[PDB]
C-alpha cells in the first residue's frame, strides 16, 4: 500500500453532544415543504417526489440518490385559521360527480380534530401497495391512495405542512448524485 496513515487517537464525548452513522436518522426528522392555499389542497402521495422550484424537504433532497422506496410516511399540519377539520383518504376511481355527494361518503379511515385545542395535526399515511417495491414517482399504479382534508362548509384556508419518513420506511438502489447548488445566491 505504501501508506503513511496511522489511525486516529481522539475521544468522542469531548466536543459535540452526539454522533450519527446513518442517513435514516436524518430522514426521520421532519421538515417544511410548501404552503398550500385554497380549497383543493394536494399533499404528495407515498410515491412522493418530483417537486419543482428550489425550496424542498430534506426527505425530498435525500430522495434523488435512490431508486426504490417502501413504507408509510408522516405529516404534520398547521392551519392558519383555527377551527375543527377532517382528514380522509381517496383515489381517482373513488371520486364522484353527483354534486350532492361529498368526501365523507366513501367510508375510508377518518380523522377529526379541533385545532383550537390541538393546533398541530399529526397523521401517518400507511402503505397499501400490491408490490413489495416502488420506483420513485411510479405511475404504474394510478389508483394509489391519496390524502384529502376538509373543513366542513368548504371554506378557504392555508396550511403549513411538514413531512417525514415513517419508522417503517426505507430507500434502496444507490443511483449517483444530482447536480446541486450550495451557497447563497450571488448578486441580486
Amino acid at each position: 500500500g505504501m501508506d503513511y496513515a496511522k489511525s486516529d487517537s481522539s475521544s468522542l464525548v469531548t466536543t459535540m453532544g452526539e454522533q450519527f452513522r446513518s442517513l435514516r436518522m436524518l430522514t426521520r426528522r421532519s421538515s417544511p415543504t410548501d404552503v398550500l392555499t385554497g380549497t383543493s389542497v394536494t399533499l404528495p402521495g407515498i410515491t412522493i417526489g418530483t417537486d419543482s422550484s428550489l425550496r424542498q424537504s430534506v426527505l425530498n433532497i435525500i430522495s434523488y440518490m435512490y431508486r426504490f422506496t417502501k413504507g408509510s410516511i408522516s405529516y404534520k399540519i398547521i392551519p392558519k385559521i383555527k377551527g375543527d377539520l377532517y382528514i380522509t383518504t381517496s383515489s381517482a376511481d373513488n371520486i364522484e360527480l353527483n354534486s350532492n355527494a361529498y368526501s365523507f361518503d366513501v367510508n375510508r379511515a377518518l380523522h377529526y380534530q379541533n385545532t383550537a385545542l390541538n393546533p398541530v395535526v399529526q397523521v401517518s399515511l400507511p402503505y397499501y401497495c400490491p408490490s413489495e417495491n416502488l420506483v420513485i414517482d411510479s405511475t404504474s399504479f394510478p389508483n394509489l391512495s391519496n390524502l384529502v382534508l376538509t373543513n366542513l362548509e368548504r371554506s378557504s384556508n392555508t396550511y403549513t405542512v411538514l413531512v417525514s419518513a415513517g419508522d417503517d420506511h426505507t430507500f434502496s438502489q444507490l443511483a449517483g448524485c444530482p447536480a446541486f447548488t450550495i451557497g447563497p445566491s450571488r448578486s441580486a
Binding site: R67, V135, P142, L174, A175, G176, C177
Partner: protein, 202 residues
C-alpha cells in the same frame, strides 16, 4: 443431453462494432440549455433488456412459446481487440429502471462522476485478457413478465472514458458484446400473445 433450463442459459450474440478516435468522450460537466432539456450523455452503444435477447433471438423466441411469465438474471461479456501500441479506456455500465420514473430524474444524473459510481466495469487495453464480465440482478415492481411484449427495463450502456490513441491519426479497434440468462424461473401456461395494461380492457 438437452434440457429446457439448460437451453435457456445458452450464450447469445448482442452486438459487434468498430471503435475509433474521432468519437466523442463523455463530459465532466453540464451547462444550462442541456440541463433543462434532459440531455443524455453520448455512447458507443446502448442495449435494452431483456428484449435484446428474448425478442432478439429467434431461438429463444421459440423456446418460450406458450409460457405465461418468467424471471431472469443477466450476464454480459465485453471483448475488445487492438494492437499493443494502442491507448484507451472503456466503461460498461448499468442504467437502472430509468423509464418508469420522471424525465427529470433520469437527467440530472448524467455526468462523469455519477457515471462512475453506477454498477459497472472498466476496460483498459493494457490488460492481456482484454475481456470483462458483468452481472445484472433482476429488478422491478412486478414479480414476473411475459417475454413477448415491451417489458423494457434497465438499459445497459457502453461509454468512452478515455479517447483511443495511436502513433498515427485515425487508429481503430474492434469489439463484441455477448450475453446469457441465469437463475431463470418460468411460470404459467398461456397462448402466445401480447398482453395488455390496466386501463385497457380485454
Amino acid at each position: 443431453d438437452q434440457n429446457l433450463i439448460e437451453s435457456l442459459s445458452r450464450e447469445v450474440l448482442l452486438g459487434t462494432g468498430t471503435w475509433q478516435s474521432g468519437q466523442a468522450e463523455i463530459s465532466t460537466t453540464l451547462t444550462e440549455q442541456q440541463l433543462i432539456t434532459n440531455y443524455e450523455q453520448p455512447s458507443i452503444r446502448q442495449i435494452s433488456l431483456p428484449d435484446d435477447i428474448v425478442k432478439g433471438s429467434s431461438f429463444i423466441a421459440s423456446k418460450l412459446a406458450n409460457i405465461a411469465y418468467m424471471r431472469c438474471d443477466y450476464e454480459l461479456y465485453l471483448r475488445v481487440q487492438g494492437s499493443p501500441f494502442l491507448q484507451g479506456l472503456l466503461l460498461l455500465w448499468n442504467k437502472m429502471n430509468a423509464d418508469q420514473t420522471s424525465k427529470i430524474r433520469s437527467s440530472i444524473t448524467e455526468h462523469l462522476r455519477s457515471i462512475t459510481s453506477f454498477p459497472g466495469v472498466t476496460l483498459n487495453m493494457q490488460s492481456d485478457s482484454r475481456s470483462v464480465k458483468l452481472v445484472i440482478p433482476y429488478t422491478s415492481e412486478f414479480q414476473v413478465f411475459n417475454p413477448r411484449n415491451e417489458n423494457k427495463l434497465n438499459s445497459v450502456r457502453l461509454s468512452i472514458l478515455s479517447a483511443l490513441r495511436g502513433p498515427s491519426t485515425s487508429e481503430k479497434a474492434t469489439y463484441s458484446i455477448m450475453g446469457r440468462m441465469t437463475n431463470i424461473k418460468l411460470y404459467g401456461h398461456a397462448p402466445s400473445i401480447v398482453s395488455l395494461s390496466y386501463p385497457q380492457t380485454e
